[PDB]
Amino acid sequence: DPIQRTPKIQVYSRHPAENGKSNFLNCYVSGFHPSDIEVDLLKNGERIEKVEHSDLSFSKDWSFYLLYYTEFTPTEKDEYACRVNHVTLSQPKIVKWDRDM
Amino acid sequence: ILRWEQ
Amino acid sequence: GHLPKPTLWAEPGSVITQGSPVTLRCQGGQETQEYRLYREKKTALWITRIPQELVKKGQFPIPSITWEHAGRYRCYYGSDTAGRSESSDPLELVVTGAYIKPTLSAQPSPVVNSGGNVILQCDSQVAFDGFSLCKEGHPQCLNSQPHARGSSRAIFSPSRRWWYRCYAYDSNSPYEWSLPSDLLELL
Amino acid sequence: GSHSLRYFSTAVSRPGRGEPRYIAVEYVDDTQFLRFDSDAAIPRMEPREPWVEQEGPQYWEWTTGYAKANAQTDRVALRNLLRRYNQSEAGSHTLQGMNGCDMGPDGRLLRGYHQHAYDGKDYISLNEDLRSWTAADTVAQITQRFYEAEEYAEEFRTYLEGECLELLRRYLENGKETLQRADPPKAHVAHHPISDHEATLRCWALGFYPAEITLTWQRDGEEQTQDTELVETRPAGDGTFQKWAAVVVPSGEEQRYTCHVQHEGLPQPLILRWEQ
């Protein structure tokens, strides 16, 4: 009875992305269990060194959720991504920052 | 004080 | 303005792992008919990346593959203002892997008269919604729900026995399936 | 309107790498005002909000030791709970806990929260009467008997009765510019053509607090609930949240569909249409 759950990944900027304005990139990882989780932020595929996180917390279903975020200035040439890996997840997952709002 | 108790 | 219809299939198989090239082809409608493909829900970006020379032949090559290519696809021809065909989208293009190995759990012996209907069991320690049984891999696969509400569990040819595969996925991402299970087929 | 005060706990063991990991946080409403981190340097109770950074030293020590005792109790509980059901010590296990109280505009208590879980299950929880507690597994009713012997339900009933209203009232008074705010969302509609004579519409609600919100698409007044697609509420990092709800529409019927937003920060719910 170890159970398990799997992380849910969303890549979103705080403010509507506009080239030439300071904004943070957010990767929100939720729905996962156990607590240990390996998540990452990539600028054009290469590791970005400075990152922070929300304090480890869970929802009513006893499932952990974290938020990694890094300041940047958006531009049309630079592609961004988030890279998550877990005990449930085998090959490291990567999701791309997409223009929405 | 310790709250909760287990 | 006689209404035609195309036919869609993937080359080969309906189930592909990561990094494995698979070609999506839809045929008419003679040659060279002007085909157009699209993906439901999220828009498939690489459809513009495939050269129109091949697009008019159908056969969307998709060199290698990624998890983003997974989804439902539909092919039609004629666009508007002149004529159009009704598109058929039976296929669900699925990528397998990126998740944990689902566990195989069996009732009595795998070799019986085979006219016993079909009864298997496929568990997983993780909590996923759907479980997929691939026999051949016309006949391909079938999708199934969990048995119990809380736990993730699902209960389910004398001459030539087909293959066997089980998969597990979260229903919100139906086209991302876990890694291919252990082989319960003949080998 | 109503407000809540909640404290979490999480402990995950590391085999062979030393003592288990422990982390716990305190949320008032949707915002955490404190943190406690075991493996970080100088472990203590660190204020996460400026309005709580002005408290006296006796309060900060109260919260530091208050977290330390709970940390040790949950740690040894993880220890002796490991051996209870059939597991070798090489496994990584986690336990979670939750408590708090809910206050209304009148200043009284609504329903208290005392709940504990081990390794993604349910272990024990208080009832609506806050006396008898429900258990789950065969391990849970013996500690149910211990909690019956201690009569802990009435004691923690009092602590969630008079005292957590004083804590929550103090936080609301100090944090009125934060805890008492209601932030209405910034909502619009996005149109992405999916195919020929078919498209998709996204309903964006941005920068809203608290996290409670409702997004419902309707065509001609009838709800699309079976056809609608929701994503979990996600934080924007300053305490504001985000949500979007998309529906697939036949192109040319674009105007039949309207998004409907319901939020506490709104005087009345909102209706939105794609601007064309």
UniProtKB/TrEMBL annotation, chain D:
Gene3D superfamilies: Immunoglobulins, MHC class I-like antigen recognition-like. One of its GO terms (cellular component) is early endosome membrane. Keywords: Disulfide bond, Glycoprotein, Immunity, Membrane, MHC I, Signal, Transmembrane, Transmembrane helix. It is found in: Cell membrane. It comes from the Eukaryota. One of its GO terms (biological process) is antigen processing and presentation of peptide antigen via MHC class I. Residues 185-263 form the Ig-like domain. It is a single-pass membrane protein. Belongs to the MHC class I family. This is cDNA FLJ39643 fis, clone SMINT2004023, highly similar to HLA class I histocompatibility antigen, alphachain F. It comes from Homo sapiens. The lineage of its organism: Eukaryota, Metazoa, Chordata, Craniata, Vertebrata.
